[PDB]
Each structure stands twice: as C-alpha cells, then as structure tokens.
Amino acid sequence: YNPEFFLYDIFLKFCLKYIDGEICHDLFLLLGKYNILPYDTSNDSIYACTNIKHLDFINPFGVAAGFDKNGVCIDSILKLGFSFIEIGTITPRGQTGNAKPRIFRDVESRSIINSCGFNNMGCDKVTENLILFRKRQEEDKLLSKHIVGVSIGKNKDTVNIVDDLKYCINKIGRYADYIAINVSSPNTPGLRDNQEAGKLKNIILSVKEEIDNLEKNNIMNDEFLWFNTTKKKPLVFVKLAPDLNQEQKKEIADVLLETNIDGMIISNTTTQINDIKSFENKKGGVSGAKLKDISTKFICEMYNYTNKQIPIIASGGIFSGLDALEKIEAGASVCQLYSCLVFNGMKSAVQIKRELNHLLYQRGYYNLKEAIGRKH
Ligand SMILES: Cc1cc2nc3c(=O)[nH]c(=O)nc-3n(C[C@H](O)[C@H](O)[C@H](O)COP(=O)(O)O)c2cc1C
Ligand SMILES: CCn1cc(C2CC2)c2c([C@H](N)c3ccc(C(F)(F)F)nc3)n(C)nc2c1=O
Ligand SMILES: O=c1cc(C(O)O)[nH]c(=O)[nH]1
C-alpha cells in the first residue's frame, strides 16, 4: 500500500493519446531525476532470486538498454522495484541520433517503433553520472544490492567497431557490474555485419581481454578498484538481433561457446513486423508485444544452439508474469522490460513481480532457478 503510484497512472492514459513518445521519455527521466517517482520498498521473494555466475540479482526484472541512455535517472528507476538497469547504449563521443520524429507508439498492439540511432551524451559524461550514482549507492540502503550494467556500441561514423568499444571499457569499466556489447541495433547503418563469426569472435575476445587488462596495472587491492556492486571485474554479455538466418545463428552460438561469453541477451528490436497500420512507411525497429513470440523461440533456439552452456537474458515483449515464465522456461535466467513501462507505466515492476511469484506457486516450482529450461 503506497498511494504514490496511482497518482501517475491517471496521466498515463493521457500520454498515450496526446503526448509524443520521446516527450514522455524525457518527462519520465526528469521526474526520477528529482526523486519524486514512487517507491517499492517491499522485500522480494528469496525464491525469485537469480544469478549469472557471480552476478546475484535480488529479483529477475531490470529495465533494458535505451531506457536511461545516459544514467541520469538510475536512482529513481531502480527504486521503482527493479533489481538492475542496463544503461546505454553509449558511444565514446556524444551523438545526437536521427530525425527527432524518432519513436512512435501503437496502444492497441502494445507496440513501439524507434529510429533513435544511439543518441547519447558520450562515454565521458555518462561515466561522470554513473560515478555519482555509485557514490549515492554507498550511502543509500534502497540501492545497496542493486546492479548496473552498461550497454556499449559504436558511433555511426566510426571506422572500426573494436576501437570504440575499447575506449568505453577503459573509461567506464571500473563502475559497471557487467558490460553488454550491442552489435544488434537496426537503426545504425552497418554494425549488424559485425555479427559475422570472425569479427564477432575478435570483438568478444578484445572486450573480455580489455576488462581483464584493468586489474594488472594497479597499485591498490582488487577490493577498491571495482567501484561497483560486486567489487569484482565486470562480466561480458552480448546482445543479439533476431533478424538472422539459422545458419548464422549457429555460427553465432559457436562464437559464444568458443569465446567463453558470460551471457547472451535475447533480443533487440526487429525490422520484420509489417502489419501495424499506424506504423506503415515508418523507419526503425519495432518493440513490444509483437516481438514476444519471435524472441521466445530465439531463446529456445540459442538455448539449444549453445547446448545450455551460456545463460540467456530475455528482452522482447515482456508484459506479464506469465510472459516472463515463458522466457524463463525457454532458457532465460533473467528478464528485461521496456515497452511494459511504456504502456503499463510505473506500476509495472510491482505488478509483474506479484504475478510471477503467484505463478511459481501454482506451477509447483520450488524456486525460480528450477524453471530454466523445463518445457523443452
Ligand atoms: C526507444 C528505444 C530505444 C532503445 N535503445 C536501445 C539501445 O540503446 N540499446 C539496446 O541494446 N537496445 C535498445 N532498445 C531495445 C530495447 O532495449 C529492448 O531490447 C526492446 O525494446 C524489447 O523490449 P520490450 O519488448 O519489452 O519493449 C531500444 C528500444 C526502444 C523502444
Ligand atoms: C518510447 C519512449 N517512451 C518511454 C516511456 C517510459 C519512459 C517511462 C513512456 C511512457 C510512460 N509510461 C510514462 C508514464 C507516465 C508519464 C507521466 F508523464 F505521467 F509522468 N510519462 C511517461 N509513456 C506514457 N509514453 C512513453 C514513451 O513514449
Ligand atoms: O539497439 C538498439 C538501438 C536503437 C537506437 O539507438 O535507435 N534502437 C533499437 O531499437 N535498438
């Protein structure tokens, strides 16, 4: 019972019908900047705790990349009831993006189409913000167990992807719990060509290597170097696009097994949806419910491509507790939300968290970890 939630749900219906999508995004981020967003301070179910190696998540719901592309709103977003957040995608130097008429919504289909183009303030400034949060985190008990991941990418005009990725790792590595490599954005020309097994292999090795390089050349203990939640080196995940052929998707898996990737996010937006009349002749990748079923199979695909050896992070059309369980049973260990917060709002995390707890009770599972890969 926290009345501070519904006050915002009143205005939600207004926004979906009148306010431009990005104007709603900036407004939301502004609210959390001033710490006036609702609070979910109830303990989470110990049966819902999940992990990926030494990453321990209090609950299995964070917000996906592109939500807080610059980490100026981490404190409040997390306090809504999310265990972690993925900030970014970030690039070395700031970028403005594309034609500001970028993101559009369709309420009925619960879908979104976006053509942002990695609009961010740059690696240096976003690093300043994350540092401020980590300091606030040490003096706040509502942030003591929460995790922050950083999605990294390349500028549109970069000549080589590896160079940009490394500059980020070397500037913001110490403050990240994990690092997700975004080589799947459909709104930045090219990039997806890096999904080729050869270049993807070199990419993964370079990133994993670059993170390993931060320890050696220090004068202090490993305890003080990592100013993060784990106090350990950041793990390396990779985000993949759904628009691949089955042959490339087994090539991809081969790279992840060969390179010992710590995780595989599944998945980003798609460019194959063409049955939304309000989205006809509009550029960008589609998000929301229409991406649900497509991504789910991609989990089963990659969970069987990779021989169950790489944990999977679920992202795509997740709105309800049963949606999350679908992702879990397919092979995912954790879930990310975005469109759910666009259409369901600030009450999303609490809503979806109560629904998942209740479903695990009826399905007979003792805890969440028991459900990964069970309807295969
Ligand atoms: C406006 C917008 C911006 C996004 N920006 C990023 C991004 O910068 N990096 C990334 O990896 N994914 C980005 N995404 C994709 C989301 O992180 C997520 O994968 C996708 O929206 C599916 O989630 P959903 O179906 O729950 O909405 C973005 C999506 C939208 C709608
Ligand atoms: C696709 C961009 N993006 C993002 C959001 C997410 C940022 C939180 C959108 C929302 C959101 N559910 C919301 C609720 C309440 C308010 C307000 F103003 F009441 F505080 N603002 C935004 N909405 C309605 N549209 C979004 C969007 O387009
Ligand atoms: O990975 C990404 C990136 C973008 C963007 O910045 O435009 N948009 C998406 O839908 N996915």
Q: Which atom of ligand 3 is nearest to the CA of 118?
A: 6
Q: Which residues contact 37 (CB under 8 A, 6 or more apart)?
A: 8, 31, 76, 77, 79, 80, 346
Q: Which atom of ligand 1 is nearest to the CA of 103?
A: 1
Question: Residue 125 to residues 69, 112, 118, 187, 254: CA-CA distances in angstroms?
Answer: 11, 28, 15, 23, 36
Q: Ligand 3 centre from 211 Cα, in Å?
A: 24
Which backbone phi and psi does 160 adopt, to 5 degrees? Answer: -140, 140
Pick from 144, 161, 142, 145: which is nearest to 153 by CA? 161
What are the structure tokens assigned to 178, written together? 């994990």
Q: Ligand 2 centre from 175 Cα, in Å?
A: 28
Q: Ligand 1 centre from 290 Cα, in Å?
A: 13
Residues 261, 204 contacting (CB under 8 angstroms): yes
How many Cβ atoms are within 10 Å of 376's Cβ, its own excluded?
A: 11
Pick from 352, 268, 291: which is nearest to 83 by CA? 352
CATH of domain 2-376: 3.20.20.70
How many Cβ atoms are within 10 Å of 351's Cβ, its own excluded?
A: 18
Point out the catalytic residue in the list 111, 151, 185, 267: 185
Mutate to test the pocket of ligand 1, among 67, 151, 287 (most ligand atoms within 8 A of CB): 287
Cβ 88 under 6 angstroms from ligand 3: no
Pick from 76, 163, 52, 70: which is nearest to 120 by CA? 70
Euclidean distance between CA atoms 55 and 229, whole angstroms:
9
Q: Which atom of ligand 1 is nearest to the CA of 88?
A: 8
- Residue 278 annotated to the active site: no
Q: Which atom of ligand 1 is nearest to the CA of 69?
A: 8
Which one of the ligands is nearest to 5 CA?
2
Mutate to test the pocket of ligand 3, among 98, 113, 118, 286 (most ligand atoms within 8 A of CB): 118
**Domain ranges within the chain, ordered by starting residue:** 2-376
CA atoms within 13 A on the CB side of 34: 6
Which backbone phi and psi does 245 adopt, to 5 degrees? Answer: -80, 155
What are the structure tokens assigned to 327, written together? 């992702």
Euclidean distance between CA atoms 74 and 80, whole angstroms:
10
Euclidean distance between CA atoms 170 and 29, whole angstroms:
27
How many Cβ atoms are within 10 Å of 245's Cβ, its own excluded?
A: 8
Residues 77, 85 contacting (CB under 8 angstroms): yes
Residues that constitute the known binding site: 65-69, 89, 114-118, 182, 187, 239, 268-269, 287-288, 315-317, 338-339
String of DSSP letters for 95-142: E--S-S--EEEETTTTEEEE-----EEEHHHHHHHHHHHHHHHHT-GG
Residues 299, 240 contacting (CB under 8 angstroms): no
User: Would you give the distance in Å from CA 332 to the centre of its chain?
Assistant: 13
What are the structure tokens assigned to 197, written together? 């097994």
Euclidean distance between CA atoms 74 and 58, whole angstroms:
16
What is the chain's length?
Answer: 376
What are the structure tokens assigned to 106, written together? 């369709």
Q: Ligand 1 centre from 286 Cα, in Å?
A: 9
Helices (H) and strands (E) in the chain, counts: 12, 15
Q: Which helix (H) or strand (E) holds 217?
A: none
How would you class 26 by CB atoms within 10 Å of its CB: exposed for 0-12, middle for 13-18, buried for 19 or more?
exposed
